[PDB]
């Protein structure tokens with residue numbers, strides 16, 4: 001099955017998922033000089049104060065922190081978006097080394113990791129319906145660089161010991177995702193896809209310009225997770241990122257000058 005090894009990694013995915021070679025695949029390199037400021041873009045509205053986190057899961061590709069998405073408790077609106085998008089989960093992609101790990105790049109620069117807050121368009125009623133629509137999902141992407149610790153990340157880091165292997169989960173209530181944001185909400189946006197199979201072309205990407213800083217110790221703990229299940233040969237969960245894909249017939253817009 002698909003993964004991030006030499007034998008089943010991103011360069012192989014097209015055989016099972018031909019949309020991998022589609023017209024709006026993600027991630028992409030963000031060429032900052034080519035993106036254009038769009039004065040018609042609105043500020044992002046990130047309304048997370050009523051978010052209800054539930055659980056943290058190792059799914060064999062990353063770990064997801066899942067939220068109650070049965071009501072409009074944590075929603076993304078504004079920016080390039082038409083309508084209301086509910087937070088369902090967040091997860092990260094990261095590297096084996098601090099100089100790689102992000103999926104998007106900025107003028108070809110790779111960050112140590114990238115956080116994805118995944119939201120679905122409530123007009124489609126459920127996530128499974130939303131992913132079948134060109135405007136079904138909105139993903140907020142945030143780069144991580146290594147420097148000072150991110151205080152609001154530590155609760156996530158500290159629970160990882162308990163979800164080491166694929167299939168493990170733990171309670172993860174009362175977590176506030178506002179603690180994972182940078183100061184500025186300036187962003188780039190473009191139409192794209194899921195970055196894991198099934199690679200569906202259903203995402204409005206909103207990638208924040210300002211990275212968050214996390215400490216070396218925080219990211220080192222991500223790298224102790226396992227892709228494998230319990231009792232199987234250990235394969236460290238590292239380099240779980242898809243490389244940049246061709247931009248094709250797309251323009252990246254900036255919310256800032």
Ligand SMILES: [Zn+2]
Pocket residue numbers: 091092093116195
């Ligand atoms: Zn992701």
